[PDB]
Design a protein around this ligand. Structure first.
Ligand SMILES: CC(=O)N[C@H]1[C@H](O[C@@H]2[C@H](O[C@]3(C(=O)O)C[C@H](O)[C@@H](NC(C)=O)[C@H]([C@H](O)[C@H](O)CO)O3)[C@@H](O)[C@H](O[C@H]3[C@H](O)[C@@H](O)[C@H](O)O[C@@H]3CO)O[C@@H]2CO)O[C@H](CO)[C@H](O)[C@@H]1O[C@@H]1O[C@H](CO)[C@H](O)[C@H](O[C@]2(C(=O)O)C[C@H](O)[C@@H](NC(C)=O)[C@H]([C@H](O)[C@H](O)CO)O2)[C@H]1O
Ligand SMILES: [Cl-]
Lengths: 15, 417
């Protein structure tokens, strides 16, 4: 679930 | 093929494999490995004595002979700079009755010296810069060749001519001495030298022929690290961009992406040296996808963060020509690719490699090459994947400026900073 928080950040980063 | 001495590793020993059968005595202080590398240290028993076949020496007056080898000379100590610059020491010697040849080092200089029986002496050297941000010579394997005829003594580096001395004033040079491998002179206890593929020829080698030997002896099925050593699986590495020499990768704060930063430099006050720090940025590790990393292997590019091994991914469905790579825990996820195939697109000798993302170990589709790109933040450089590189790498001659070109830097005792 911490991973999910990281994935969410990644998608911010590229959008 | 005109080779009269060919020192090679065999059975935890170095042996002359020229076919002329010289005696080679390697003493206990010499460190060896099966990659043919040998190490000369400051200790007294760290030496090699070679007793030549007395039937095939070089011609003492026409002076028609060549010496080739690879060498790796450690970086200076930041606090031993004056001893480094000023102390000359011999590394290899072939002298009889005070005549013959020798190979010497004086800091960043490597020197060839001839002495005729009359006592006349002439030298020629190769010197490399000690102020470069990134040097291709400091602490990295490179190829040396010295050739002699009656008129000129020349030094070639990596197949190319560097120095040229007229040696006409040199008369008869005694040829038949023992060759002694040993650091000789005023040196530090920490001073050492790595060498490999030492060979002597009874001919003046041409540049064309030397440039070929450089290519042949450069070739391997496996990749190399920054220093020119084998690149390995399961080994910690810093990452260098041969297209962005002064940049490094850092995990962005509380973000799963790689930002690109400028290397810190030598910041002490000495005005003889300059360099960029090499031991900075994320620490990576290469894993097999199922020892030595070979071209076309399938790998995982991982790195250490928070006492844990994280992984470098690409988003499967990125839209633009490039995109930020995803640096995150090891995880199954259908939104990302983890499979990288490691490449060497350059046809010429190099320590650079490229990293190609694919769907798996079977697919023929190519997702992009790992590289560096400036993103819209004001702009900012990030660790990226790119399909743009995919056509650029097709260009001839291979473009060395592409940011898809990477080298791996492990810690090394020959580089302190
Ligand atoms: C400069 C740039 O970002 N190039 C990217 C390009 O962007 C387009 C425009 O670019 C140039 C260019 O220099 O490439 C200008 C040229 O005149 C074009 N050439 C022509 C017409 O002959 C050329 C393009 O390559 C096209 O392929 C051909 O059309 O583009 C850029 O000027 C333009 O700019 C913006 C404008 O400035 C903004 O103000 C405005 O808002 O919008 C426009 C666009 O919106 O944008 C153009 C595209 O829109 O786009 C292509 C994609 O086709 C590439 O992205 C290219 O960027 C290159 O990306 C790759 C990754 O895919 C690398 O990241 C390149 O950077 C690095 C690298 O790592 O390789 C960093 C290194 O420092 C540098 N190495 C060094 C120091 O040696 C290398 C580089 O490889 C070497 O410099 C040479 O290979 O680059 C990145 O440049
Ligand atoms: Cl380089």
């Amino acid at each position: 679930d911490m991973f999910a928080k990281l994935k969410e950040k990644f998608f911010n980063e590229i959008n | 093929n005109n080779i009269i001495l060919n020192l090679r590793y065999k059975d935890n020993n170095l042996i002359d494999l020229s076919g002329y059968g010289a005696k080679v005595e390697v003493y206990d202080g010499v460190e060896l490995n099966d990659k043919n590398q040998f190490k000369l240290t400051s200790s007294a028993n760290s030496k090699i004595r070679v007793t030549q076949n007395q039937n095939i020496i070089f011609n003492s007056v026409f002076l028609d002979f060549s010496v080739s080898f690879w060498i790796r000379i450690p970086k200076y100590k930041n606090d031993g700079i004056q001893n480094y610059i000023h102390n000359e020491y011999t590394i290899i010697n072939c002298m009889k009755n005070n005549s013959g040849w020798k190979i010497s080092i004086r800091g960043n200089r490597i020197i060839w010296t001839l002495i005729d029986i009359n006592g006349k002496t002439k030298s020629v050297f190769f010197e490399y810069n000690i102020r470069e941000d990134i040097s291709e010579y400091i602490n990295r394997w490179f190829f040396v060749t010295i050739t002699n005829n009656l008129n000129n003594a020349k030094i070639y580096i990596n197949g190319k001519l560097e120095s040229n001395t007229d040696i006409k004033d040199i008369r008869e040079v005694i040829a038949n001495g023992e060759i002694i491998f040993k650091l000789d002179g005023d040196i530090d206890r920490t001073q050492f030298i790595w060498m490999k593929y030492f060979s002597i020829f009874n001919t003046e080698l041409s540049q064309s022929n030397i440039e070929e030997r450089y290519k042949i002896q450069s070739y391997s099925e496996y990749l190399k690290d920054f220093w020119g050593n084998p690149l390995m699986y399961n080994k910690e590495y810093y990452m260098f961009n041969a297209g962005n020499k002064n940049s490094y990768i850092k995990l962005k704060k509380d973000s799963p992406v790689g930002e690109i930063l400028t290397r810190s430099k030598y910041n002490q006050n000495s005005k003889y040296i300059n360099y960029r720090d090499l031991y900075i940025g994320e620490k990576f590790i290469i894993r097999r996808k199922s020892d030595i990393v070979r071209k076309e292997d399938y790998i995982y590019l991982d790195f250490f963060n928070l006492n844990q091994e994280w992984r470098v991914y690409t988003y499967k469905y990125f839209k633009k020509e490039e995109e930020k790579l995803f640096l995150a825990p090891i995880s199954d996820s259908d939104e990302f690719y983890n499979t990288i195939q490691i490449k060497e697109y350059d046809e010429q000798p190099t320590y650079s490699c490229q990293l190609l993302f694919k769907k798996d170990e079977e697919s023929t589709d190519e997702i992009g090459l790992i590289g560096i790109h400036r993103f819209y933040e004001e702009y900012k450089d990030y660790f990226c994947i790119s399909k743009w590189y995919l056509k650029e790498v097709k260009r001839k001659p291979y473009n060395l400026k592409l940011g898809c070109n990477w080298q791996f830097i492990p810690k090394d005792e020959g580089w302190t900073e």
